[PDB]
């Protein structure tokens, strides 16, 4: 319980939702990134990416 | 009224003059309601000295002080001033009557309110007024109770002089001599019957 | 605010008899580094002490006096 | 704050929402409320100016008359990105700006 | 809604949400935006259960981005609901299509420097409708915590004559008639015990005048911050003289609330108590006129009824028992002071709702990048109008469209103008109250209008009143789908526009009213579909 | 159509605890409210309501000299069993011309509390138009007739609208014939 | 409990010491209930001193004598001994309260009975029992009504020979003389606090 609590309730990459619009929240749900752990960074990535 | 439906299961008892209703120290077991007559509520000290707490007239309850609490002794003597046709209700049944109808209790509590007012007045008269003002308030109040006749300009009372002794609770020589002091001051005219201007 | 307040108290206390103002100023430590007592209005002016109470009271009525209490009244709400 | 156009400005002019006029110029209007003495103390001046007296407006105009102020947009590349115009007091939340600059 | 679509509006308004289900056959008991109650039929109703089939409902709420949440119906009761239908709209949906913005007039012109660079001009009349005017629910709070000097208590007591300007008021007083209250007033009066301070002669003389008893429980009341035009719409809480006034009055409030709660919820049950006697005989006139309580002494027979005399008595027991319970809990919980928990002495909650008329600085736009800042609201008489006298909602600068190259907005515009073309026809058919035959004729003429429309309907399927519901629900607008790359052609919109009797290119002579004249050339006219934003001068200044 | 003042259970700006209808949507449901006044040119109404159900104009403490033409003109709704509602509505008399915005732009006066100011979309002046004809006098055929298309609510005689207008213009221009 | 029910209809004011809550001559619209504190009733004289008729503490109603009749003027003054919290309603709300629920009026009636009783004893004593005996009845009744500390060998009271006197009716140096007689009679001890041994 303590684990599945901690992790469901502590993370990067999870945050409050864009509620202003059903479009914004689907395309928030239809959204992709190249960042995070194991990912890129703005300063490291270039134009090719 | 309630009086007749009451009377049909006879508790109404017709008492002759003086016949003592309450002996204080009896255990409280019955409420009354005076249907006819006048009553003396009175007390005694152990050395025979006696004082009247109040007269109680028709329309009034005797003995209500025990209805509220278990197993009390009656607070005063209650003795008939004259021939009294008197109701009796037992407490455990009169409380059922309260449960059935508290409308009576409004009039009842209004009477009690007037009784408290006059009792506080009497403590004031005792602590703070000498004999003269007490019997002025007497003869004044006597000039308002509904038995008084009119004497063309002024009020009239002729009760010769025994019942006042028992109302105000005093001697009679002093009543006389100050009835005379008021006669000098031109406020009463008494020769046994005192005319309150 | 503090500057205006104590300037106004200087301006109010400036107009008394010298004894009233001086016992008040020094007795409440106004304008120096001391905590003066009426034991010391005793020990200094005259060993009289309680007349200093009746001098302070007179000065307060002289100075509350709502032709003067209103520069004080903005400070009621402090 | 956000900017919009002043088509009827003269060259020397610029808008000023009087709210911020007041906020930046409270010491002048306070000194001037003490000078006139309506606000006899700074408790009085501050409460009077929270309550926005009618005189706070005319005296804001008085103080602001002939009282230049600067204007700066980011990025300040060269000298003329920042200039100094004369105020024009408005109750329009958008700054008005002489279109040629 | 949007008049011009692409076809994808519906499934997105849907798949951002979910659906519902039904219950046994019956008669619809109670009708509402969000709830329905049904009563199940007697034969369907099992004898044990009452079978009041009831449904659930919807309400308001804030957003993560301080905007409004709610749901409403697009439907009626006593109509068949095909499965998968939208029974209740959303913040941005209506009958199951998207709704991001509003449909209204446009004309593309310069104007006296008011649409100089990308700015927007607009009539006064659109905010008389408030149709862009809108809301922002905001939040406010009170943590009531443990204080060493004692718990922060909810109370508010005040010396210092009037605790001023209350001195100057009329008889009424800022709580003025009908509990009226200004900006700045208190909502939740919390006090905090106070320490002591340097005992200077002035203030000590002041609290020798007024003399706040002892411990001097400092003020911490939760107030209206300065200038608020919002709505302190509700309070949740999370667990002196006027102290006692306010808290026993809170008790007045709460017991009246909950005595109401009682009296409704048990006046329900008193029907069955009575009736349960009337089963097993009938006291057909012996029941009622004698006082209701004394009926168990009426009709009584052998085995199975005394059990229900006592079930009846058990109701008489359980219910007044639960009131005794709730009374204990509620009365003590209002009677208690604040003394709650570690750090949680308590927490009180507030949220706002700010709604007022729109004004310069707000940023408006369409659906092709076509931004715009506001710079004035234009009186209507000061809008461009036509010989019809009918003035423009908004004026736009066409300074940039060649350099912006958003020609889809142009096409959007034309296909919107033609659509008001059909909406006015139905309008006139409404005020003129056409016969069923004509409604049928014109409306089926409307649906089968396009060149080779993929999508097809007949109205003879429907009855008359269904066409009446149909025409009584369409009047805010029927939409159209221009799929994106399967979009429309110049030929279609031009045929469609002249079907509206309008100009082929929708270019119409416009009159100023500052002098009444005509301008030189005609102007493009037609209706665009535009978007408000959260990027407001409100949210910027 | 003038104004509203809301004062009810809680604090009084302005919808509180069991109203669907936030504030501008109750007032916009009062804009289309139709009131006729007959004797006077000025009125103030009041309302109090409570408990679950639609809050309408029939519950209004109508003044006796006021003709409410729609008692079903919806106002608000009550949701919670606990919810209850008390407010006041300022029906018409106005003065001058359209809305609140320009009104307070005129009005330096600031008014006590409760008062929620409203845009004026009115009553017996809805839309207008006109037409200059050529009057036929036998010779002076280029003379002009006018024809004024007027559109209202009821509640105004248009000839009265027109007489009032001409008297008004006479009296304005007293400032230019009698006064310079 | 039903007190909570009563207070729940009320509107509770704070009142600090010396506050004259009720005055004689004004008109009756409010029934009072003492949430907290202790108060003193009074009557005044046409030229002279005043009389406390009795003292009232937490649990009592005030005002009720007006309750039962319309247009009744207030009978006495009632001054706060301590800072009080007073639960107030108007009489019309009280008539509503009577019809809604019993059992406040019953407690009120039992209290009214008790008060008529002890003022009757006061009058018996004012008339029969002498001032030393009035002190005896009073210091007896006070040994039955507590505020005391119950001193481990003996009994005490915080009396400065002023509340005993005013309950009874006398002056100061004289009752000094008598309680010292009582001391020499081994009946009393006092220095600021009297020890009724
Ligand atoms: N002060 C008084 N005023 C009026 N009636 C009294 C007074 N004292 C006693 N009584 C009445 O006299 C009765 C004597 O016995 P009870 O105490 O049982 O009930 C008493 C009352 O009815
Ligand atoms: N002698 C007494 N004993 C007890 N209570 C009294 C006495 N005299 C007056 N009171 C009470 O004091 C109150 C003063 O105001 P009221 O007239 O409202 O009602 C009075 C009674 O409740």
Cα dihedral B166, B171, B175, B177, rounded to 10, equals: 170
Q: E133-239+338-356 has which fold?
A: OB fold (Dihydrolipoamide Acetyltransferase, E2P) (2.40.50)
**Residues 17-56 of chain E whose Cβ lies under 8 A from any Cβ of chain G:** none
Q: How far apart are CA G89 and CA G29, in angstroms?
A: 9
C54 touches chain D (CB under 8 A): no
Co-location of G109 and G177 in the same domain: no
Contacts of G124 in chain B (CB under 8 A): 43, 45, 51
G134 and G181 inside one domain: yes
CB C25 within 8 A of CB C13: yes
**280-319 in chain E: CB under 8 A from chain F:** none
G touches B (3+ CB pairs < 8 Å)? yes
Please check if G64 is assigned to a binding site.
Answer: yes
Q: Where are the domains of chain E?
A: 1-17+93-132+357-540, 18-92, 133-239+338-356, 240-337
Rounded CA separation G56/G62 (Å): 9
Same domain? G11 vs G97: yes
Q: How many CB atoms lie within 10 A of CB E457?
A: 11
E331/G11 Cβ within 8 A: no
Q: Give dist(CA D98, CA F20) in Å, integer.
A: 47
Residues of chain F with C-beta less than 8 angstroms from the C-beta of E62: none
Question: C-alpha distances in angstroms, C20 versus C36, C54, F120?
Answer: 15, 10, 68
Closest residue by Cα to residue G9 from G42, G35, G28: G35
Tokens of B122: 């009497």
Q: Are residues B76 and B169 in the same domain?
A: no
Q: Which domain holds residue G36?
A: 1-123
Give the whole-angstrom CA distance, residue E150 versus residue E338.
9
Do B32 and B6 form a contact (C-beta atoms < 8 A)? no
Using the CB atoms, write b or e for E267-294: b if 16+ within 10 Å.
eeeeeebbebbeeeeeeeeebeeeeeee
User: Which one of B123, B158, B184 terminates a domain?
Assistant: B123
3-class DSSP assignment, residue G142: helix
Interface check for A16 against chain E (CB to CB < 8 A): the answer is yes
* Minimal C-alpha gap between D61 and chain E (Å): 23
Pairing assessment for the beta strands B31-36 and B84-89 based on DSSP bridges: antiparallel
Cβ contact, residue pair E116, D93, below 8 Å: no
Cβ-based burial of G164 (10 A; exposed 0-12, middle 13-18, buried ≥19): buried
Q: Specify whether G154 is located in the same domain as G89.
A: no
State the DSSP string of G30-42.
EEEEEEE-EEEEE
Nearest C-alpha neighbor of E345 from the set E224, E237, E467? E237
Q: Residues E154, E190: contact at Cβ < 8 Å?
A: yes
For residues B46 and B12, membership in a common domain is answered with yes
**Helix (H) or strand (E) segment spanning residue G124:** helix G105-127
F79 touches chain E (CB under 8 A): yes
Placement of tokens 């008084």 in the chain: B148
Instruction: Look up the CATH number of the domain holding residue G47.
Output: 2.60.120.10
- Which protein residue's CA is at the shortest distance from atom 1 of ligand 1? B53
Alpha carbon of residue G44 to chain centroid: 16
Give the right CATH number for E240-337 from 6.10.140.1670, 1.10.3720.10, 3.20.20.70, 3.40.50.10470. Answer: 6.10.140.1670
Which stretches of D37-85 are DSSP H helices? 42-50, 54-64
Asked if E13's CB is within 8 angstroms of A20's CB, the reply is no
CA distances from E158 to E201, E212, E216, E243, G16 (A): 20, 8, 10, 11, 15
Q: Token digits for F119?
A: 């845009």
Experimental technique: cryo-EM
Judge whether E409 and E370 are in contact, CB under 8 Å: yes
Closest CA–CA distance from residue F138 to any residue of chain E (Å):
30
- Paired tokens of F19: 């109203």
> How far is the centre of ligand 2, averaged over its atoms, from the C-alpha of B115 (Å)?
11
Contacts of D9 (CB under 8 A, 6+ apart): D88, D96, D97, D98, D99
Q: What CA–CA distance (Å, rounded) separates B111 from B90?
A: 21
Classify the C-alpha dihedral E387-E392-E395-E398 as positive or negative: negative
Mapping DSSP to helix (H, G, I), strand (E, B) and coil, where does residue C62 land? helix
Give the residues surrounding ligand 2 with Cβ less than 6 Å away.
B 120; G 22, 41, 53-54, 62-65, 75-76, 78, 115, 119
Residues across chain E: 541
Regarding chains F and C, contact by 3 or more CB pairs under 8 A is answered as no
The DSSP code for D3 is B
Are B155 and B95 members of one domain?
A: no
Q: How far is CA D72 from the centre of its chain?
A: 15
For residues G137 and G121, the answer to whether their CB atoms sit within 8 Å is: yes
**C-alpha distance from G111 to closest chain E C-alpha (Å):** 26
Q: DSSP letter string over F96-159?
A: SSS-HHHHHHH------SSEEE-----SS--EEEEEE--B--SS-TTB--EEEEEE--SS--HH
Q: Assign residue E268 a region: left if phi > 0, alpha if psi is -120 to 50, beta otherwise?
A: alpha
Residue with tokens 């009265």: F160
My answer on whether B117 and B133 are in the same domain is no
Query: C9, C12, C65, C77: best mutation site toward chain E, by most E Cβ within 10 Å?
Result: C77
User: Could you tell me which of B145, B144, B142 has the C-alpha nearest to residue B161?
Assistant: B142
Q: How many domains does chain G have?
A: 2
Chains touching chain A at 3 or more Cβ pairs under 8 angstroms? E
The closest residue, in CA terms, to atom 16 on ligand 2 is: G63
Q: What tokens does D3 get? A: 């900017």
Q: Which sign does the torsion angle of CA E192, E196, E197, E203 carry?
A: positive
* CA of D2 vs chain C CAs: smallest distance (Å): 37
Query: What does CATH list as the number for E18-92?
Result: 2.40.50.100
Structure tokens given for E456 = 């097809």
Q: Is C67 on the interface with D (CB under 8 A)?
A: no
Q: Which ligand is nearest to the CA of G33?
A: 2
Domain end among B103, B123, B143: B123
The H or E element containing residue B157 is strand B155-157
What letters, b where the CB count within 10 A reaches 16 and e where it falls short, cover B128-158? beeeeebbbebbeebbeeeeeeeeeeebbbe
* B44 and B129 within one domain: no
Neighbours of G51 (CB within 10 A): 19
Both tokens assigned to B85: 């046709």
Asked if residues E366 and E374 have their Cβ atoms less than 8 Å apart, the reply is: no
Query: Residue G181: which H helix or E strand, with range?
Result: helix G172-184
Same domain, B143 and B104: no
Q: Residue F54: what are its φ and ψ, rounded to 5°? A: -70, 135
Burial of G165 (0-12, 13-18, 19+ CB in 10 A): buried
CA–CA distance, G172 with G184 (Å, rounded to integer): 18
Chains B, A in contact, 3 or more Cβ pairs below 8 Å: no
Find the helix or strand (DSSP H, E) in which B72 lies: none
- Give Cβ neighbours of residue B50 (< 8 Å, ≥ 6 apart): B42, B43, B44
Query: Residue B68 contacts by C-beta under 8 Å, 6 or more apart in sequence?
Result: G106, G109, G110, G113
For G75, the 3-state DSSP assignment is coil
* Chains adjacent to E (≥3 CB pairs closer than 8 angstroms): A, C, D, F, G
Contacts of B129 (CB under 8 A, 6+ apart): B137
Breaks in chain F follow which residues, C to N over 2.5 Å?
A: none
In which element (H, E) is residue E17 found?
none
- In units of Å, what resolution does this entry have? 4.5
Cα(G114) to ligand 1 centroid in Å equals: 11
Helix (H, G, I), strand (E, B) or coil at E60: coil
Closest by Cβ to B113, choosing from G65, G106, G110:
G65
Residue ending a domain, among B95, B123, B151, is: B123
Cα–Cα distances in angstroms (integers) from residue E207 to residues D87, E57, E200, E243, F63, in the given order: 49, 56, 11, 20, 52
CB-closest option in B109, B110, B117 to G75 = B117
CA dist., res. F151 & res. F124, Å (int): 8
Assign domain E1-17+93-132+357-540 to its CATH superfamily.
DNA-directed RNA polymerase, subunit 2, domain 6 (2.40.270.10)
Same domain, yes or no: B85 and B109: yes
Count other C-beta atoms under 10 Å from residue G116's C-beta: 17
Q: Which two tokens stand for residue E484?
A: 């994106």
Torsion, CA E194, CA E196, CA E198, CA E203, rounded to 10? 60
Q: How many Å apart are CA E313 and CA E295, to the nearest integer?
A: 12
| Identical fold, E18-92 and E133-239+338-356 | yes
- Residue pointed to by tokens 């449901």: F29
The shortest CB-CB distance from D2 to any of E112, E114, E537 is to E537
């Amino acid at each position: 319980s303590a684990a599945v609590k901690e992790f469901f309730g502590s993370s990067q990459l999870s945050q409050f939702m864009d509620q202003n619009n059903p479009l914004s929240e689907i395309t928030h749900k239809r959204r992709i990134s190249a960042l995070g752990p194991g990912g890129l960074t703005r300063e490291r990535a270039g134009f090719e990416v | 009224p309630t009086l007749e439906w009451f009377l049909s299961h006879c508790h109404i008892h017709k008492y002759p003059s003086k016949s003592t209703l309450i002996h204080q120290g009896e255990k409280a077991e019955t409420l009354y309601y005076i249907v006819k007559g006048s009553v003396a509520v009175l007390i005694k000290d152990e050395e025979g000295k006696e004082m009247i707490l109040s007269y109680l007239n028709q329309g009034d309850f005797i003995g209500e002080l025990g209805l509220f609490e278990e197993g009390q002794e009656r607070s005063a003597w209650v003795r008939a001033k004259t021939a009294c046709e008197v109701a009796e209700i037992s407490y455990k049944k009169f409380r059922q009557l309260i449960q059935v109808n508290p409308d009576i209790l409004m009039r009842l509590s209004a009477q009690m309110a007037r009784r408290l007012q006059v009792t506080s007045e009497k403590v004031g008269n005792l602590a703070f007024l000498d004999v003269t003002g007490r019997i002025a308030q007497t003869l004044l109040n006597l000039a308002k109770q509904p038995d008084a006749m009119t004497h063309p300009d002024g009020m009239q009372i002729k009760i010769t002089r025994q019942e006042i002794g028992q109302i105000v609770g005093c001697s009679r020589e002093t009543v006389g001599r100050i009835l005379k002091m008021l006669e000098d001051q031109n406020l009463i005219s008494a020769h046994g019957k005192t005319i309150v201007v | 605010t503090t500057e205006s307040l104590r300037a106004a108290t200087h301006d109010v206390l400036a107009g008394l008899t010298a004894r009233e103002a001086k016992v008040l100023r020094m007795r409440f430590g106004i304008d120096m580094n001391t905590d003066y007592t009426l034991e010391e209005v005793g020990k200094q002016f005259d060993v009289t002490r309680e007349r200093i109470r009746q001098i302070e009271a007179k000065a307060l009525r002289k100075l509350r006096h709502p032709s003067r209490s209103e520069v004080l009244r903005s400070f009621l709400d402090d | 704050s956000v900017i919009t156009v002043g088509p009827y400005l003269r060259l020397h002019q610029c808008g000023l929402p009087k709210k911020m006029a007041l906020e930046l110029f409270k010491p002048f209007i306070y000194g001037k409320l003490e000078l006139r003495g309506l606000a006899t103390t700074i408790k009085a001046a501050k409460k009077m100016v929270e309550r926005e007296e009618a005189v706070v407006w005319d005296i804001l105009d008085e103080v602001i008359r002939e009282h230049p102020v600067l204007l700066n947009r980011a990025p300040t590349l060269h000298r003329l990105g920042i200039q100094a115009f004369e105020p024009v007091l408005i109750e329009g939340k958008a700054i008005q700006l002489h279109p040629l600059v | 809604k949007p008049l011009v679509g692409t076809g994808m509006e519906r499934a997105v308004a849907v798949d951002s949400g979910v659906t519902a289900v039904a219950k046994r056959g019956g008669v619809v008991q109670y009708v509402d935006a969000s709830r329905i109650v049904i009563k199940v039929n007697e034969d369907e109703m099992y004898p044990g259960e009452a079978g009041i089939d009831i449904y659930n409902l919807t309400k308001y709420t804030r957003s993560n981005q301080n905007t409004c949440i709610n749901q409403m119906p697009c439907v009626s009761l006593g109509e068949p609901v095909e499965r998968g239908d939208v029974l209740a709209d959303g913040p941005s949906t209506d009958l199951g299509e998207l709704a991001l913005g509003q449909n209204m007039r446009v004309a593309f012109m310069p104007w006296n420097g008011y649409n100089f660079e990308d700015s927007i001009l607009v009539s006064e009349r659109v905010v008389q409708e408030d149709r862009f005017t809108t809301i922002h629910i905001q939040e406010l709070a009170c943590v009531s915590r443990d204080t060493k000097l004692g718990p922060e208590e909810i109370t508010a007591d005040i010396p210092n004559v009037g605790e001023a300007a209350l001195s100057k008021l009329d008889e009424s007083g800022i709580v003025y008639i009908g509990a009226e209250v200004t900006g700045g007033d208190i909502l939740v009066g919390k006090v905090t015990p106070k320490g002591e301070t340097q005992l200077t002669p002035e203030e000590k003389l002041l609290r020798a005048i007024f003399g706040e008893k002892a411990s001097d429980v400092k003020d911490s009341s939760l107030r209206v911050p300065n200038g608020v035009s919002g709505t302190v719409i509700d309070v949740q809480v999370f667990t002196d003289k006027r102290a006692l006034e306010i808290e026993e009055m809170q008790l007045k409030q709460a017991k009246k609330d909950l005595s109401e709660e009682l009296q409704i919820l048990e006046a329900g049950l008193f029907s069955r108590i009575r009736a349960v006697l009337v089963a097993g005989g009938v006291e057909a006139e012996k029941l009622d006129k004698l006082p209701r309580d004394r009926w168990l002494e009426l009709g009584l027979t052998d085995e199975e009824k005394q059990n229900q005399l006592e079930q009846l008595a058990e109701q008489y027991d359980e219910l007044k028992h639960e009131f005794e319970k709730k009374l204990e809990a509620k009365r003590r919980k209002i009677t208690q002071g604040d003394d709650l928990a570690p750090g949680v002495l308590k927490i009180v909650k507030v949220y706002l709702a700010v709604k007022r008329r729109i004004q310069p600085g707000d940023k408006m736009a369409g659906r092709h990048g076509n931004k715009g800042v506001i710079s004035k609201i234009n009186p209507i008489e000061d809008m461009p109008y036509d010989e019809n006298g009918t003035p423009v909602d908004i004026v736009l600068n066409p300074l940039g469209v060649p350099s912006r190259m958003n020609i889809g907005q142009i096409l959007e515009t034309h296909l919107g103008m033609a659509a008001k073309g059909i909406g006015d026809k139905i309008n006139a058919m409404l005020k003129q109250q056409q016969e069923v035959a004509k409604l049928r004729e014109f409306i089926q003429r409307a649906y089968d209008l396009g060149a080779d429309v993929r999508q097809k309907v007949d109205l003879s399927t429907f009855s008359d009143e269904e066409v009446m519901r149909l025409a009584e629900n369409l009047r805010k607008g029927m939409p159209i789908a221009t799929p994106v790359f399967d979009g429309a052609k110049e030929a279609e919109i031009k045929e469609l526009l002249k079907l509206g009797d309008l100009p082929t290119s929708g270019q119409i002579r416009l009159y100023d009213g500052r002098t009444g004249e005509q301008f030189e050339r005609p102007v493009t006219v037609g209706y665009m579909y535009m978007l408000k934003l959260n990027h407001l001068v409100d949210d910027k200044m | 159509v003038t104004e509203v003042e809301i004062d009810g259970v809680l604090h009084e700006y302005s919808t509180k605890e069991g109203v669907q209808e936030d504030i501008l949507e109750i007032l916009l449901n009062l804009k289309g409210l139709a009131v006729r006044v007959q004797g006077k040119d000025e009125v103030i109404l009041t309302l109090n309501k409570s408990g679950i159900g639609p809050v309408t104009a029939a519950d209004i403490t109508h003044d006796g000299d006021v003709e409410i033409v729609k008692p079903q003109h919806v106002i608000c709704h009550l949701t919670d069993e606990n919810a209850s509602i008390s407010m006041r509505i300022k029906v018409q008399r106005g003065r001058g011309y359209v809305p609140a915005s320009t009104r307070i732009h005129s009005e330096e006066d600031e008014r006590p509390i409760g008062r929620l100011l409203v845009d004026a979309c009115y009553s017996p002046v809805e839309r207008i138009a006109y037409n200059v004809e050529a009057a036929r006098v036998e010779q002076r055929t280029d003379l002009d007739k006018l024809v004024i298309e007027m559109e209202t609510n009821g509640t105004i005689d248009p000839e009265e609208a027109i007489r009032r207008a001409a008297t008004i213009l006479a009296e304005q221009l007293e400032a230019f014939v009698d006064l310079r």
